[PDB]
Design a protein around this ligand. Structure first.
Ligand SMILES: COc1cccc2c1C(=O)c1c(O)c3c(c(O)c1C2=O)C[C@@](O)(C(C)=O)C[C@@H]3O[C@H]1C[C@H](N)[C@H](O)[C@H](C)O1
Lengths: 101, 105
């Protein structure tokens, strides 16, 4: 099985991409994710509330009438993160190439 | 963010060891070149990371041979976790792709 700290990191990435598709409520998020995962990924409510309280605390999402939305801070951090993980991709690719030669 | 810098640092170090056993100085140099100078890791960061990885059985060390250097290696458990990790992260990418596609339809 996969490490747990890495399982949460994966779940955070997925929830944020859902909100990126559009504002959403918990039921819609778990439903959309289950379908998008061909049934394989069943998120529990309390895991989302645990995760959503933290993202709200960090200003990454906000709520309203209960819908959740990706803030402008959230959109910005998703770009930096995606670019950072891109630099990593190249570092690893450089390591492979340098190994061969 | 620090937790993302360290998570990334772990992934890079683990992939170095995937490429082959190596010693700390060689690892920092290889990463420095691979990042085109962007990532210069210090000795003490690797020692911090290698203590936790070795404790969890993800790497081990041994003495290689003029002069002697302490080499580190990815255990068979470590190779397996990298397989599991790479596969899970791959499915995540597919789930997200599905979320956009499913969105329109
Ligand atoms: C939208 O990208 C992200 C946004 C936020 C966090 C993340 C990521 C991310 O994509 C990401 C990864 O893709 C990977 C990891 C990761 O934790 C994140 C994020 O946290 C971990 C990983 O390196 C392993 C082996 O554990 C596997 C995977 O890398 C992929 C691609 C690499 N080039 C390499 O092939 C690796 C083995 O698999």
């Amino acid at each position: 099985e996969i490490p747990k700290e890495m399982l949460r990191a994966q779940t955070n990435v997925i929830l944020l991409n859902v909100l990126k598709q559009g504002d959403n409520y918990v039921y819609g998020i778990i439903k959309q994710v289950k379908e998008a995962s061909n049934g394989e990924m069943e998120l529990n409510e309390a895991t989302l509330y645990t995760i959503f309280k933290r993202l709200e605390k960090d200003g990454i999402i906000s709520s309203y009438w209960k819908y959740y939305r990706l803030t402008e801070i959230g959109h910005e951090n998703m770009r930096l993160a995606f670019e950072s993980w891109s630099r990593v991709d190249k570092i690893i690719e450089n390591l492979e190439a340098n190994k061969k030669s």
